[PDB]
Structures are given as C-alpha cells and as structure tokens.
C-alpha cells in the first residue's frame, strides 16, 4: 500500500509539477489578454475571442 501511494504520488507529480510551473510561467510572462473592441474592418481569428493563453492555444491548435 505504501509502495502504491509512493508510485501514485510520483506519477502524478512527474507531470503535475511541470504543468503547475509552466502555468505559472505563462500567467506571469505571457499572461492574460485584454478585452478590446473589434477594430473597423478587422475580422478576428476564432481563437482570438478567448482570454487565457492556454485556452487560445487549445482553440487554435485542436478545435
């Protein structure tokens, strides 16, 4: 049981700590977008309607 709990915590943290650190790096350096009105004649991209950078990456790459 202790070996299972050690392996469970290890394989969660193995990618959880890079995901948490990467999200912190994104939210500090890259960071959240700003709500602006659409400029005249400009048609935005479909992924440019979203606020957080990871949401923009998901809507651009996959969706």
């Amino acid at each position: 049981d202790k070996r299972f709990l050690k392996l469970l915590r290890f394989y969660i943290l193995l990618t959880g700590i890079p995901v948490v650190i990467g999200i912190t790096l994104i939210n500090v350096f890259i960071g959240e977008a700003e709500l602006a009105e659409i400029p005249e004649g400009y048609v935005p991209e479909h992924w440019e309607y979203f606020k957080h950078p990871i949401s923009r990456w998901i809507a651009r790459t996959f969706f």
Binding site: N27, G31, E32, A33, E34, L35, A36, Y49, R56
Partner: protein, 171 residues
C-alpha cells in the same frame, strides 16, 4: 474591475473613528501589521507581474453575432433558415438567463449591503427582479427539455390569444 452601471453600488459612507476609551484597539495595530507584512509584498509581486504583462500586450474580443431572421419569417420545414433562427433563439435564451443572473446578483448584493433595513432599502431591486422574472416566465417557462423556437413561438401565440380574448371580453 467591472462596469458600475450594470452592477450598481450606492456610495460608501464610512464613519470617522471616534474612540471614547483609552485602551488602544488591536484592530489598528493589526491593520498596520497587515499593511506592512502582507499588503505591500503582495502589491510588489503584483506590480512585477503587471510589468511582465505590459512587456507584451495582446487582446481578446467580444464575439458579435449579427441578427439573422428569426423563426416567424422562416418557412415551415425550411431547415436552412430555421436553423439560423434556432441558433439565434438559443443564444438569446442563454443571454436572457445571464440577465436574470445579473439581476439576482444585484438583489442579493443589495440584501447583504443594506443589512438590517434591507426590506425597505431594496424595494427597487426587488421590483426589477419581479419584472424580469415575470418576463422570463412568460417567455421561457414550461417549454420542456426539448425546447426550441417553435415551442416558444407556440407559447407566445397561445398567450397572445388569451390576452386578445381577455381584452375583447372586457369591452
């Protein structure tokens, strides 16, 4: 922040501290301790993060749906028109849901803010809430889980027949 018109707040009136006793209150010392130990480092880290945001600015936009023809000027069983009308109706339904949510937020915020005299001091928010719930209930209640623009139009036609009959029989 947010727009103060859609989420209204009456202006704050805090009283000046007028202490009668001589013993120093712990709250001012804990407030200065909070300001020195907590609020200034939080403000410094937030200013650092806001500088990093200001290094690379970019924008997201509010998606503007232009108004398409609604269900009444769509032909019967014309899926290309009534699909657009149905999508328009569903977006309007979800927006009206969020309008009722905004007015509930105003009402509950008023009740907490006014405190003990909330029954007198929140009559306008209660009136706005009763009006918007009356409109929402006449518009979308009893449609069912398979709701559509056809169901809502049939409910509106039944209500308008009832209102026309009641106005006709009153004369």
């Amino acid at each position: 922040s947010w727009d103060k018109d859609v989420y209204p707040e009456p202006p704050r009136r805090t009283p000046a501290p007028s202490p009668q006793t001589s013993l120093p209150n712990p709250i001012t010392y804990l407030t200065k301790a909070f300001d020195l130990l907590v609020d200034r480092p939080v403000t410094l880290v937030r200013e650092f993060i806001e500088r990093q945001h200001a290094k690379n600015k970019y924008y997201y936009y509010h998606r503007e749906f232009r108004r398409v023809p609604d269900i009444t000027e769509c032909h019967e069983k014309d899926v290309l028109c009534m699909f657009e009308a149905e999508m328009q109706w569903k977006r309007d339904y979800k927006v009206d849901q969020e309008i009722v949510n905004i007015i509930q937020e105003r009402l509950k915020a008023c009740q907490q803010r006014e405190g003990e005299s909330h029954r007198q001091n929140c009559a306008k928010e209660l009136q706005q809430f009763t009006q918007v719930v009356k409109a929402y209930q006449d518009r979308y209640h009893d449609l069912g889980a398979h709701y559509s623009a056809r169901k809502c139009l049939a409910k509106q036609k039944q209500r308008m027949l009832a209102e026309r009959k009641a106005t006709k029989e009153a004369a």
